[PDB]
Design a protein around this ligand. Structure first.
Ligand SMILES: CC(C)c1ncc(Cl)c(C(N)=O)n1
Ligand SMILES: CC(C)c1ncc(Cl)c(C(N)=O)n1
Ligand SMILES: [Cl-]
Ligand SMILES: [Mg+2]
Ligand SMILES: [Mg+2]
Ligand SMILES: [Mg+2]
Ligand SMILES: [Mg+2]
Lengths: 194, 194
């Protein structure tokens, strides 16, 4: 009942563009919406985010998260490891790669979502969420070697899965970080289960 | 270590703008980033809210109430938590309860309210509060609930059992052209993982 009629380019950056989308509203009326798009999509989705479940025997299972300065936010954020999928890269392979680069961990694919939207009111950006397990008792993950690209500066924060929401709430209160909405949603559901 | 040096307007729409962000990298070098921002953010602690609405009814399994809308940036229908911008002077809780009723017809009760969390912090500065609300589905007010969507708002309500959320979302994806929101998917995955 609703659909895209046309798109007008407003402003094209190197990495992001602003567009104005004309669409047919369900009453038969023509409307416009200002939308953002990345200039980099080819792929299934722009990117992957990894849910990295760090399993060590006789320890609480941890969720592995990353802290980085985000220029749009003007501040430090706590997030699942994530980045863009390379052209010709599968989402699974992008997930293990990004996980290793950002955290140094070598993980195993558990499951992979369909493409999901990040902020569909604002952008067309999508990701696959890839749940990965990390055998923290394997020698490859003993002294994990984080291999950032040029211009990445990433701190690793592992938090117990069974108290994740209370732990994140602590970090916000006392470290003045912003927690990512996907991380917070995951943590909430861990509490709301049953 | 890292911080914003300056922010220069690239292009400003009515609703969304693009900025060139200059910041200090952790090595002591100046770099730039193309940033997205909304034009609507005033004194709010966040742009918006998303509501996790838990529909509770005697002798029913609890449901998560979700909305389906056409999203011009996406060129399609998306399934998302009820959500909208916080009006100037409005509290996150009030905005959540109001957006829930407008989008679904349900009158909820506040359970909890997140700090401001980031939507896509590599792309934008957009933040929300994630507000968990319970809906008493035994109350007569919530018996035959009708959306009161605003001008240009067109919303379908989809209520799915919490105990099978991920499989139900997967079945909707497999039977139509549409996209699940990343927050919804993250919440459904943690329900499974718990
Ligand atoms: C709900 C807010 C964000 C809004 N209202 C109306 C329009 Cl038309 C747009 C837009 N992006 O152009 N955004
Ligand atoms: C990772 C990609 C999306 C990227 N690389 C470098 C820059 Cl500098 C920007 C930007 N938005 O300005 N984005
Ligand atoms: Cl798991
Ligand atoms: Mg990254
Ligand atoms: Mg990376
Ligand atoms: Mg809305
Ligand atoms: Mg609304």
């Amino acid at each position: 009942k609703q659909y895209i009629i046309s798109e007008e380019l407003i402003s094209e950056g190197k990495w992001v563009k602003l567009e104005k989308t004309t669409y047919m509203d369900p009453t038969g009326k023509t409307r416009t919406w200002e939308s953002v798009k990345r200039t980099t999509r080819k792929q299934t989705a722009d990117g992957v985010a990894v849910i990295p479940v760090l399993q060590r025997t006789l320890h609480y299972e941890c969720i592995v998260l990353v802290k980085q300065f985000r220029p749009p936010m003007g501040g430090y954020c706590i997030e699942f490891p994530a980045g863009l999928i390379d052209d010709g890269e599968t989402p699974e392979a992008a997930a293990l790669r990004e996980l290793e680069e950002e955290t140094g961990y070598k993980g195993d694919i558990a499951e992979c979502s369909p493409a999901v939207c990040m902020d569909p009111g604002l952008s067309n950006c999508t990701i696959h969420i890839v749940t990965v397990t990390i055998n923290g008792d394997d020698a490859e993950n003993a002294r994990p070697k984080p291999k950032p690209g040029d211009g990445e500066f990433v701190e690793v924060i592992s938090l117990p899965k069974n108290d994740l929401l209370q732990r994140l709430d602590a970090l916000v209160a006392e470290e003045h970080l912003t927690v990512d909405a996907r991380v917070y949603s995951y943590a909430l559901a861990l509490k709301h289960a049953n």
